[PDB]
RNA sequence: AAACUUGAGUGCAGAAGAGGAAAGUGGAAUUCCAUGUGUAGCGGUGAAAUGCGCAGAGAUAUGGAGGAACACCAGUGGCGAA
């Protein structure tokens, strides 16, 4: 019932609508999340700052309770709460080893979606 | 009718180019599908809801399938009759 795993990847998706952060071993197996939604923000308050570190502070709690000490940061999304959920996750007492950018970028692919008229 | 070389071509020696046609080879990303971890939302908006998820979604890790387009370079830069 209770993992023993010292070193972890905290991976922070952090969009316009919201923020959600996954924290995983180093081989990707997942031991916590929550996010902005999880925890009752709604709308405009899902994307807040103080939204995506109270998902971050949740998240490292109770991946803590599995014995997780030290984090290496995986940050992917343009939003607001990307510096947030990073400082959250060193007051939770994990210490983010180091810090990498993971957002996606094509090389000329996909067509996107229509502009928004209005 | 006879000359001439300045126009226009040809030769010779150089120069740059997303000019065109046909094969082949890449890497990023999107979608879908398959499993592992995991959990109560995700997604979306001015705000919502429809939708998707609890028959395990989203997220994260790995693998596979397929199509389309080629980040950076990249510039009143280049090439072309358009």
């Known amino acids: 019932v209770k993992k023993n795993i010292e070193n972890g990847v905290a991976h922070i998706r952090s969009t316009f609508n919201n923020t959600i952060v996954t924290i995983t071993d180093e081989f990707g197996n997942a031991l916590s999340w929550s996010s902005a939604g999880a925890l009752g ?13 109270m998902a971050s502070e949740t998240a490292s709690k109770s991946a803590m309770e599995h014995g997780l000490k030290t984090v290496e940061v995986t940050v992917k999304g343009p939003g607001p709460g990307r510096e947030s959920a990073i400082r959250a996750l060193q007051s939770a007492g994990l210490e983010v080893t180091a810090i990498r950018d993971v957002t996606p970028v094509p090389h000329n692919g996909c067509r996107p979606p229509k502009r928004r008229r209005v």
């Open 41 to 53: 923000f709604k709308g405009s308050k899902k994307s807040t700052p103080f939204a995506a570190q």
